[PDB]
Design a protein around this ligand. Sequence first.
Ligand SMILES: *[C@](O)(C(=O)NCc1ccccc1)[C@H](C[C@@H]1CCNC1=O)NC(=O)[C@H](CC1CC1)n1cccc(NC(=O)OC(C)(C)C)c1=O
Ligand SMILES: *[C@](O)(C(=O)NCc1ccccc1)[C@H](C[C@@H]1CCNC1=O)NC(=O)[C@H](CC1CC1)n1cccc(NC(=O)OC(C)(C)C)c1=O
Lengths: 303, 302
Amino acid sequence: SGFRKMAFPSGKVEGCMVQVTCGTTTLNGLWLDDVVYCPRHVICTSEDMLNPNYEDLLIRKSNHNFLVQAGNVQLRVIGHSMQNCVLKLKVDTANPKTPKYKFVRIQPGQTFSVLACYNGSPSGVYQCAMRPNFTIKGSFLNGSCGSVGFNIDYDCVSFCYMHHMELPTGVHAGTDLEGNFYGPFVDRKTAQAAGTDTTITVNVLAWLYAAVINGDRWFLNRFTTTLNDFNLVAMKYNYEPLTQDHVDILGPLSAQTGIAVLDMCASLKELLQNGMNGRTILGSALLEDEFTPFDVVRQCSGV
Amino acid sequence: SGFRKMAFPSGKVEGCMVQVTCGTTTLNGLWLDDVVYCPRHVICTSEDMLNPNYEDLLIRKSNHNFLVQAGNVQLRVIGHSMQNCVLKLKVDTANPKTPKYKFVRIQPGQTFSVLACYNGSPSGVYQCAMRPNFTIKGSFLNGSCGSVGFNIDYDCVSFCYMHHMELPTGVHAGTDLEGNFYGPFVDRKTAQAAGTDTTITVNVLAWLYAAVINGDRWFLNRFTTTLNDFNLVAMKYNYEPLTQDHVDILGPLSAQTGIAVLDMCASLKELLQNGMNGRTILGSALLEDEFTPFDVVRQCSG
Ligand SMILES: *[C@](O)(C(=O)NCc1ccccc1)[C@H](C[C@@H]1CCNC1=O)NC(=O)[C@H](CC1CC1)n1cccc(NC(=O)OC(C)(C)C)c1=O
Ligand SMILES: *[C@](O)(C(=O)NCc1ccccc1)[C@H](C[C@@H]1CCNC1=O)NC(=O)[C@H](CC1CC1)n1cccc(NC(=O)OC(C)(C)C)c1=O
């Protein structure tokens, strides 16, 4: 038993991380087969960053201007191509530890593991939700750019995030592995801000389910609410509306505990309205919204 | 920017995980060079247990009774011994993926990463602290036994924990990799009680420095305290004593923030006496005690 924020084992991704230097700029790339993927802003000086003409900056770069290091081995670059905000560097050597992988775009409210790297060396691993405002609550310093976010399903790595930037309020923005930003963000040194965030109602209910499965159950009550009457209180507190698809997605946790979603909703309404009165749920004194229903099932059934 | 509960990358440990089976029981083993380490209770059934005589039960096992699988390769067991509560199984093959490593016994308040495994297959990585009562707050289901805790120093993996058992209210116990339990626990099927836990004071101060490094400053007051006057208040709220050694260990964070340790103690004293009054620190509504000073410096620096 017990319930913890849990990342995927990162070994399959660690074997792909490399360092990419272009003149003065060093950051991280992802080496899969004979291609290294990284943020295109590797070609910029801070001069270029106010309004960078990436197409014109890239014309002035040769294969030779890209230093790619995997451990203590130099990889020779034999081709460069740009796709949206990502640079693809073709190398002579294919990554022999390339795992089975796909590039996917995660939806808001879904979770992934971040492998934070510096100089192409993994430093740490932690779990993030793609927020409704298309930011993540991460931990990234200078050199973290080109760090990736992923899910593992069996032997297959689904790469969903490459790190690009920090925003006021200490949150982070990046692109999918095709180089499209999540949210309205741009890869240049302009003032940008995240929109107002919302709480991911479906994820809070999943976590309440997690609590109950682990025997932390003091917040359960005999009361029930309609979906409409629940959503009246949710909207006031800046929680996403709960849809019938959310109620259906919570079906496995509801069946496993025997607590109906609309019974659980009466707990959550009381917690929103009256707070926790000095008590904790799974060691937290506030409502956690960064576990998906699938994250709870995976951890409580142990795959 | 941002501050997260962070684990070490697990790759170097993933390549060491194997499945150990003795008839009916399967759990995880750690394969380093030509030795597999696993909990000794892999030799029991329900038949035994409640209070098994492990030395006795191990006599009546043979090398061949240990099925060791590394992915879908069978390892040949050519030797076996018990050391405290772990089995060391000698195998015909050295692990090609053995990282540079040590075995260390960690102290209460120290943190480590857990790679939770099922059938020799890693499932997840998370960060833990050795509580003052020598339990950990883990996430471990049936089959998790033999999962290990570790720190990574540069290239070198320090193994500090092997998972053995669950205790009341969802907490966990295990041994070091020499098979000595952390705490007054035994690998018996019998009821055992943890002992009352306390807050790791040096770790709360470390995390208040993390808060200041990351732009959370509201809880700083303009007071200082003596070590003694601080501990008078700490002990009243179930906090570990803060030693001069803890003050000295908070030095680097002190210098990096220009907030003296005893000034930060005066801020914590006020937080214990008056509460947080519904405000958060680094996204938490209570005081977090599972970041060491080392963890704060590591994450804020590289
Ligand atoms: C990323 O580019 C990176 O790591 N680059 C390599 C490098 C940088 C610095 C020194 C050595 C090597 C960084 C990652 C950032 C830095 C701190 N934590 C992070 O997540 N991203 C940027 O610096 C980014 C580049 C832009 C998108 C193309 N950038 C540029 C300018 C400003 C910001 N943000 C910013 O100033 O935000 C506030 C909160 C205002 C400080 C930015 O992210
Ligand atoms: C460990 O043995 C394991 O994972 N392998 C055994 C196994 C069981 C079922 C199927 C396949 C393999 C487990 C790990 C436990 C299970 C639940 N969570 C864990 O972390 N260890 C034990 O079951 C352990 C063995 C004892 C030390 C030698 N054990 C046995 C009996 C009771 C408990 N604890 C217990 O019941 O705790 C209370 C607080 C009473 C609920 C126990 O840990």
